[model samples]
Target: AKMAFTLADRVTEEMLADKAALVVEVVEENYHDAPIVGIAVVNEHGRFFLRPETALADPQFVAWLGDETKKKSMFDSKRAAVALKWKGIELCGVSFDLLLAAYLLDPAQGVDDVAAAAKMKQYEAVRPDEAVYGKGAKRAVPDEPVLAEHLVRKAAAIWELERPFLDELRRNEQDRLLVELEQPLSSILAEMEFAGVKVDTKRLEQMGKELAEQLGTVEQRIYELAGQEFNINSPKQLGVILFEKLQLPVLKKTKTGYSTSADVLEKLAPYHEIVENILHYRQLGKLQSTYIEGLLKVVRPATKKVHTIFNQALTQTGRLSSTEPNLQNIPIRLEEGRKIRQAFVPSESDWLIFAADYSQIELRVLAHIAEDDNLMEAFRRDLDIHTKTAMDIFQVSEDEVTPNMRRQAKAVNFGIVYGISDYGLAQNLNISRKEAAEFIERYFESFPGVKRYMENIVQEAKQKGYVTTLLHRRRYLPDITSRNFNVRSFAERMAMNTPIQGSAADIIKKAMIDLNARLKEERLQAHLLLQVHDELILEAPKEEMERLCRLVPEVMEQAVTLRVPLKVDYHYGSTWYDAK
Candidate 1:
């Protein structure tokens, strides 16, 4: 959408010519926002005529698009870098995603277009989409000339907006973040989208069938336990079964009845086998409908693979989110439900899915940021982090630290990062609240720097109204200043925690960017396929397997320098498997 299109209030022959080269602005056909009609003028020779989505809905125009010439020697600065990626063409020798660049510059900027971004920077010509398209469904496209003129101006607005963003990226010391990091990540993600992960469709279908059958079995068990058959999937029905029929304790209640959420069921688990079975049954059915069957449905017919879209602009933490068959969401924590990954096989014969995961990255991030000598030393000594934590907090020898103790300590370690309270930890471990509070105090006494770091970060956020990652990726939490306890406490947690988690995100992202370059520079045949949490998946040729194993971890470990060395544990198999 554009405030204006042509040069100085006039549309030119150059704007509509066949040699025009401008980034297309596309929108949905479903009575969309036409707020800013926009176009770009190029000193370099490229074709300029553009098509509006509404006009393109015309059957003849749709046919024309099918036969439209694939132009070469043109580089249109597409709005989102992923757009060029989705085109299934790489001939545009170079390109930039204006939207991607804009987001990485200031994630909290609250602008998603040229006009809004331009207006924020005090540019007059920028027009918001709502302004162009009146807030109504009965709206129709304007006269062809009027629409064409608007498109050009919007395009011009986009061009005008680019300068300020670039300047601000430099101003924020985020030039590398926007240019070197996020920009290249877009291209790599595009390539990954094209070269999607292969799936064993039969395996997926079988798993779905099995989960469905298991769900039925669990459903029958829950009904038998309740002494009645009801829609177990319905919250109202399940709530009634648990609370009224079984007479289980009501931990929480909704408008109509008791809450049967996972947490509620989890707390009720010790009281009844029915609660545990229902939770298991729900998990199984969801794995079928939401994951296994979901993947089978979306997997390409010929390729037998799922091409998930990576969303960079979506996450505030700078972590990537995968959707439409979320490869990122493949169950790994549970041995029972993780049957899904077995279906994510190597694409080629004898090829492997090599995964490398950062070990306790967020904890290590906390150590670095907190600058706690004991915590940093613990990592430096290369001890089992959880075990070491138990030893220190419990004041026990390494041999004296029990498995349960280490597990509790690990929970406390991570729980502290999540801003989990005494009551929360007690609930988590099924221990006394007083015991949880004692455990927390012992933890702070063992690592006082962490407590200090936590306190200072919140104070800093209170002063500045935001927190930032190591790479200076920002997330503004306006609620940090709120008088409300829940809101302010949540914001405080965000202030202390965002830097650690967000920095981890930044490091891995930088690693991906570097890894992408290394693969190209070294001419490796490995694809840095998918990044989920701290793990990276690279599909490499057998010939280059050794090199990739060596190279990827090296790139990742060196992604960021910390007081404690970053560690990565890599594994390779014919299928996706867990190391942790």
Candidate 2:
């Protein structure tokens, strides 16, 4: 009775008609196409069944699948939503998700598989997916009898894991975080994933060619500096040319040979012009190999678009991450790296890419949480935070603050967000640790509340073994009370920063949810495309561009109420590059 499954020929109205909620999973032929190969559903009564993909051709069957009141649950519902959207169905009424529940309960123990999720809940009845369908190159779907049981077993695991997961979330006071923010977010992310970003292949190719020439030029310069030609890519060869031939300072060495790592090369930078060119060569090579070539591999030929998977549960801070040519960490520091955005264009010829990002969101979050009167006053008066910080720390008036003072102040401002130490700040500013220590002391003197908040948060984390964001998203710090200074210091930094960073993460997520609804209510053709940290990128028709410029920031600012006002900066252009 427990493993009962009816291999239904078609979906019936009675299948899920009166059911309060259902747990479902669908097997896809491919992620891009999302062609549904099999569908499995389990009711509250432990009645499990499978319907062939042919059932989707039935209007009533498809209608029931999207019915909001016909609540549903699943593992990785975002993926299921992608498959549903591929069939032209809007997924709604997701009441629970095993993946999200596990994430909410303990984000550190993030589980990607149904079996692992079940096992985490101490429900080991489910078999490992690799065992059912081998792995990688040898991976193949089994026959109906095997797959049907396999899929049903997964659905059953979700059903069993649901109560305990939800109960624990309620106990932890994270049910609202899961229900209001994450559940709704899963579907919106699916929409973004499905509405893939258009990529200009020609632009990428042009950039790739330019980078190759630049690499060659830099290589030639390095060879000239060494007074010899050698494989510049080989660290060993470069080390010999640098240390042995050029007779540069031997900063560090490894078992094999001299260390040519970035830090080592950075230190050797002042010693020789060759070291500078070598570093340039390494950057160019990475651009060619990692970004340009790496991007081209994932672009779908038919659509000329790149559909990056936004990983929701991966980050312990509740921040979203992306893969399949990660669009998140695209380098903005270098002009050449920034040029990669030229390759991201709108899907429609007349459409444009619109980007909106929160200004100093983490700092603003810190001000609100820390309740620092000086910090809050700065935001309230619309003062430049870094410049104000410079004045306060340097004990100088705003107009008297030097450029160097503001730069160091800016460094300290960001550094403090991660609970930076004098030693760490000293290295960044290239100043003595004593100077960094005094600068920090002055910062705290001007903003005592912030210092108090940092101290209290660490104590709280040590006592509770966890820290919670503004939205009550918990990050457990097991090493908070560790005997080791380095380990405990790491946890202390995490504790101080997690609440600020995680709350910033929560705010953006909430903004996305609100913006998605507003877009629907407006009935505009505009759609969200990506969320890169504090920014949201969208593709909209040229006509709607003006309206969105005003609308986007308006919605994003009001997503959550903070003591200090949230500020949003927006831009749009023919391509992502222009938009920036």
Candidate 3:
């Protein structure tokens, strides 16, 4: 039966008297097939009802039952009645603000169920210290009653605190967008987690064992070359052997001892074969221990897969970092290290792994953002960007831009993005600081806009305490205004590069989200297995391979519209190495 009743019980004497004789009917309905009952008692004061029958259960009677069957049904009945009553009420009378208040009070707690929400509140009370320190505290105890009270109070506090921001977000029409975006994005992430990539366990194990043997050989050779035996991994021992025992000239020294980093050793290579061998040993040992052994440990036992965690929040520049076996940082420059890629393979027969990376994508982005005519025209004509830059800076034609000139220009372009100093550029290119400074000056003259942009970013960040990307993603850089040159310089470079790098990251993320949506809408079985910075790896059925090869790039290119077009390159093979 349909019934209408005033939700507010308190009324004047005349109003209560006028409505006293009217027969009131209580209606109960279930949205699903569930047994629920609503009971109304028209008392002299007003119409009272047990809206939630479970709440009315006699504690003593329930305790006597011993079995939970009666209580479970009562609980369900109560839940249904409460839900129905809530739905039946007028929107204005509802406590939506209170619900939001509860959420903000305990943002970590999910409120899908009342019991869970209550438990979350209970958690907060038990750990008052946690409320202040957040989840970072080491010493924490579990308690319920304390948490319950804490949550209730917190909810109330949140309601008061969030009034202004909630109103702002609501007025901006972002309330619904914020909620709607979560589900689709969450669904995509879940699909990615499920579609973990397969790893060639046997191949990686074999490679690791071989690398161990290679390390032993290199160690023995280093001892022979040095004419003395010493612990290779100990920097102190190696330092003494190189500088004191062998009487080799020290290239540089650190507080610890002689500088034995790769760059220092490379400079000393002409003096001793031992120095070269030591550098080789260090590089190989690092690859074996960190990559091969590390990768082996993380490979999932059930599926023989490695589910690398892609972190979207870590980098202010929007570059995604990978953990639990970082795929992006895997060694690529060395052949021995490159063999590690062989472990990643296709899940199905005849289907190949594909990879495509933008050739100097960052430089291309700079060209577009700066709108440097020479750079743009070179890209438009499909000329080698670095070689073209070399020609421009050196006052030479494209044909006259030799390998060395292009290489130097490439270093200068990369150095500019990183805000490299003359000293750093000279050290990196093994040239004089004066020469490096001249190269940089020429680069700026060739692309004045990029230089201006870099300078403008530092100035803006100094004034505002932060820099923003084209999309309005802000990265705070308090250090940019610091008295310390080292600290301030790092922030300055980040301010210049954050927008470019972060925008690229944003573009790729949007692509992933869009690709996931399209795959679902098309009912394609192909799944995104991994993302390594700019590249995304997908595993799919043999039937879907062709379609994915086309779809992946299309989604990526159109993910974000920019002043300059975004492009993705593709490669595929039976194994990860083949794709590379």
Candidate 4:
């Protein structure tokens, strides 16, 4: 007879009459379905046992199996059977396997089910199409009998293959850290998702209309200057007007048309009035389209706010990403772009929006690990990091570091963190590659520790096949020792950057968790609405603004203990732009 038809079925004394050792296995494979299967092993005498089909849902059947068994041994295929035999009890073996898979996949990195499915396809043994469909060029899921049989076979195979790895991973120190540190960290992210920041729709709408009018004025001027109306937004049309009609010298050309990208236009602007007008037109156009119109579309009707999704799991280096309405991509370089912030207001009258960011966080992390005295001292003393770097690179004193020199130094400082090539640096600073390389060498000489740290991380990754954060968050780089320079270079950069960047991400996440707890404990209505890369935006009652202004920076600075102290800077205004 079957174990039981339903979970509601009752267990009786008769079920335990056979003094047997029952080993059971229950398997759950596909995330799309919740189908459970059970296999039971009842040892009647010696090593011999009776195999039985146990209904997974039947709690009484599970209880009966537990009562009958003098001892229990679990197999990979018998989770439901064992679960029943063990009376629906939790097992370390079961938890370890599931958790390890999750950790290996970096579930905290925020891959959705769809993305996970795509990744699974990359591994041959676990390929869903091969398992579900069949071995054919045009793979398709077979009919019910074939599909069902394939799934059963696949589950058994997956169990056998996964069990050994799961057992091995469970023994690993990194895997243990995942269970201890990452698992709990996941909960903090869940809370952050629930507490999305609010946006002011009316203010955004007003800004949108204003930007539209500004764009119209710019557009009218361009047509008036050209003495003929044309589509200023079209690169092809704009190129003809500038290079052909106006007889301006061509910077470059493409197969289909002339180049009209911002880089090309910026160069030509110095020599031509039309180019200057066009540059301004493009800037305002981008503001109107990307910021104003884009912002206006996403305001949630129920809350009159835009709830940006904070992604903890998207980047391999552990940096947070925002989408639906990406808060990170907000324009910061232009005055017009700054106006968009005015739409983001505090919830209360007494409150202000306090924005704090790490003063060169990646650089500070690099310094701590690199052990460069000059960089470390700059951070340790709370000196202007970029200005100091400028002085060193240019061989200038603190007083001699001009604004232009500081700007160049700032670009180089950030550029190196991303493993910038000489060509990339030259392009960024509008200097030659030789000059960029010289600046890089000088910058490295000034901060030798950072140079050593970069080299050490590459060597370590090559040796171990992965890089890990202080908290044991890992980014596996299989190609660190690749024969291809481009591939190897990419891997080397990631190896060096992942730990610094990933750890920063982990630190901020930890801070957010602590801050949320404090907010709840204090019964403050202020909400942490959004996190865009390194900054957190809040919407609080005007009354609670002052408390929040103080609390946010305090929490962020103290979020994680580092060799160098963390710093946060903030600004406040009625809208996001106003604060800046």
Candidate number with greatest lDDT: 2
Question: Candidates' lDDT values, in order?
Answer: 0.72, 0.85, 0.60, 0.63
Those runs of model 1 whose alpha carbons end farther than 4 Å from true positions after fitting are 1-21, 26-47, 51-88, 91-96, 122-150, 254-257, 578-580
Worst 10 residues of 3 by lDDT: 18-27
Strongest candidate by TM-score? 2
lDDT of 2: 0.85
TM-scores for every candidate against the unseen true structure: 0.86, 0.94, 0.72, 0.72
**Worst lDDT window (10 residues) for model 1?**
28-37
List residue ranges in candidate 3 displaced over 4 A: 1-187
Q: What lDDT does model 3 reach?
A: 0.60
What's the TM for model 2?
Answer: 0.94
User: Residue-wise lDDT of candidate 1 within 115-180, one digit each (tens)?
Assistant: 655666777664566665546785555665665554555555555566666788788787777767
Please write out the lDDT profile of model 3 over residues 1-580, one tens digit for every residue: 1222322222233322211211111122222212323322222354322222432243432232223222111111222223333333110111122222223232234342223433443432222324422454443323433332333333322223234434543664434322333223333443454455788898888888888999999999998988878999988999899889888888788997898888888878778888888988998988888888888887777678766544433455646566667777777788877878888888766667766555566766777667767666676777777887788678898889889988988898888888888888998888888988988888888888788778887899999877654434456677888898888888888888877776665556667788888988999877777776678877666677678778988888787665455668887777888776
Q: How do the candidates rank by lDDT, highest first?
A: 2, 1, 4, 3
- Residue 343 C-alpha lDDT in model 3: 85
lDDT of 4 at 576: 66
Across 70-170, the per-residue lDDT of candidate 2 in tens digits comes to 77778888877787777777667778888898888888886878888887778887787778778878777788777778777887777777888888899
